Amino acid sequence: VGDGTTTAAVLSGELLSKAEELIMKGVHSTIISEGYRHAAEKCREILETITIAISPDDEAALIKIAGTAITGKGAEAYKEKLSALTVKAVRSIVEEEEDGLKVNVLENIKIEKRAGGSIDDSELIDGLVIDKERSHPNMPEKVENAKILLLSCPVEFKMMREMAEKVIASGANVVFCQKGIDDMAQYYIEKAGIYAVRRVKKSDLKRLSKVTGATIIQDLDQITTEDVGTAGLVEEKEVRGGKMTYVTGCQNSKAVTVLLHGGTEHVVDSLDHALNDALHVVGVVIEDGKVVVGGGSSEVELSLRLSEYASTLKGREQLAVSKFAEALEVIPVALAENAGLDPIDIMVELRSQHEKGNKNAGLNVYTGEVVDMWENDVIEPLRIKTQAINAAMEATVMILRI
């Protein structure tokens, strides 16, 4: 159960019950809704004010952020190095834009796990690496200025001359086929100087399409010149265990492949899972440009500053917004309760520290203490924090206005 889901559910219940109170006291149901919706929007402003800024440049902090996604058994012998690797990969697919920075981890990073060695032997390849070799040994080892054809259809059942000839006639240097390529068709393709690979994973084909510009073809009878992608270089390199196909210098590539190394088969499985998480967290933080710290620190700050706002308002709306700001503290109170702690003790201490200007003060659920949640590597992405607050509000309001 996502921590966003959890936060929204708990906060939603609290908002509801407080609304049902405010109704059994006379306040019209529709006023509460606008008050709440104004509350949620006022939290967005307050957050942008109390968040910590993270630039694609603030490396030590990016490495600290990535660290948070890398934990559990063993991950610790690997924490420093995997963090470095995460940050170097992410930093290298950062796209500039209007509206802001974009980090497309799903499409621009592929992880290919190479069992053996140290995580230090991991490589950042500027292109796309496919664990497949040439289908025929007489095909060329390298191809400069590759012209790439992607087939999702098989090239198999003199019948085969005409089949092969339709591939040869595309102009393509390089053919990736998702399925089989008949032997005789491989001979003709081979004789034409064409680098072909058979049985390519559909997802590798998807990736080839995006980085090279190729259009995946289903009918051999309908191949266009526009259907053909390009890459600076396609070659088969030897990196032991076998051979692989490197596609570098690609057309529109921010894309990179991490060849991830670990001591053993099983080490590298865990590193992959870990890296996937860290890549995402860092991506999302870089996009937001801001992070929040956890342990109820931001709910307490929001609650405090929103109770200040409440005062500067008037009418019944004020009661509503005031009650919103009160519901927020249900998050830290739940943290204390689950950790089997005294909530009153924790809330007193959180209010004291926040009232006194410590924005990062939150509950460290394990040590039972209140501490600087940044110093203690409990980071949460801004977008989750605001999505949860807005969802709790939208769900509560949707239920009220019926």
Automatic annotation (TrEMBL):
It comes from the Archaea. InterPro entries: Chaperone_TCP-1, Chaperonin_TCP-1_CS, Cpn60/GroEL/TCP-1, GroEL-like_apical_dom_sf, GROEL-like_equatorial_sf, TCP-1-like_intermed_sf, TCP-1_chaperonin, thermosome_alpha. The lineage of its organism: Archaea, Methanobacteriati, Methanobacteriota, Stenosarchaea group, Methanomicrobia. CDD domains: cpn60. It comes from Methanococcoides burtonii (strain DSM 6242 / NBRC 107633 / OCM 468 / ACE-M). Belongs to the TCP-1 chaperonin family. Keywords: ATP-binding, Chaperone, Nucleotide-binding. The keyword Nucleotide-binding applies. GO terms for molecular function: ATP binding; ATP hydrolysis activity; ATP-dependent protein folding chaperone; unfolded protein binding. This is Thermosome subunit.
